[PDB]
Amino acid sequence: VLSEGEWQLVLHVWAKVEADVAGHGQDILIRLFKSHPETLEKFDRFKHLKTEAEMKASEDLKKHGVTVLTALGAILKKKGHHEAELKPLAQSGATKHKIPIKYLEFISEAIIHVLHSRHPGDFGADAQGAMNKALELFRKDIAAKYKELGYQ
Ligand code: HEM
Numbered sequence: 838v839l840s841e842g843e844w845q846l847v848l849h850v851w852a853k854v855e856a857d858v859a860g861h862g863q864d865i866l867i868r869l870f871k872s873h874p875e876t877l878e879k880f881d882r883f884k885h886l887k888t889e890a891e892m893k894a895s896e897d898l899k900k901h902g903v904t905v906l907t908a909l910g911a912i913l914k915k916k917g918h919h920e921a922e923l924k925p926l927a928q929s930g931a932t933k934h935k936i937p938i939k940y941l942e943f944i945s946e947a948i949i950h951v952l953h954s955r956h957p958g959d960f961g962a963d964a965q966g967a968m969n970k971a972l973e974l975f976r977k978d979i980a981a982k983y984k985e986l987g988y989q
Pocket residue numbers: 876877879880882904905906908909925926929930934936940941944
């Protein structure tokens with residue numbers, strides 16, 4: 838669990854993301870693929886994207902980014918109470934896409950990195966700490982649900 842003040846910090850930084858989901862999503866995804874290209878193979882859709890510049894120019898990729906961030910944000914706003922929200926995602930990653938927890942750890946890394954590149958002033962040791970926990974809480978919940986469905 839997280840304290841109330843930790844959630845406030847998560848939520849306080851989330852509001853900044855909210856002023857530019859599209860812009861934040863793209864950085865996040867680019868970062869992820871760039872640092873861990875093997876994750877790129879899960880996306881047949883994006884696989885042909887050769888450079889950054891081209892990643893950046895892709896409408897598809899940017900629309901995907903907003904989707905990813907939108908679901909995430911909905912989860913965080915629940916401060917722990919997100920089973921309803923979370924379930925569809927575990928179901929699909931266990932059953933359809935097969936995304937390993939490890940991949941979820943790399944994406945959390947990319948998130949942290951972006952938030953810090955964009956909002957250093959609202960992203961200190963204390964917030965960063967809080968965000969980490971929040972993302973770890975999601976990953977742990979996901980992990981359990983995955984197992985209940987038969988997927989590592
Ligand atoms: C914060 C973590 C993430 C969130 C909230 C998230 C959310 C979503 C959402 C909401 C969708 C659309 C519906 C669905 O297919 O279930 C999706 C699709 C997908 N996700 Fe993620 N995702 C996350 C991380 C990842 C990671 C780390 C990977 C692995 C490399 C991944 C691979 C995919 C793929 C391949 C699809 C199919 C999308 C498409 O083809 O339209 N996702 N994700």
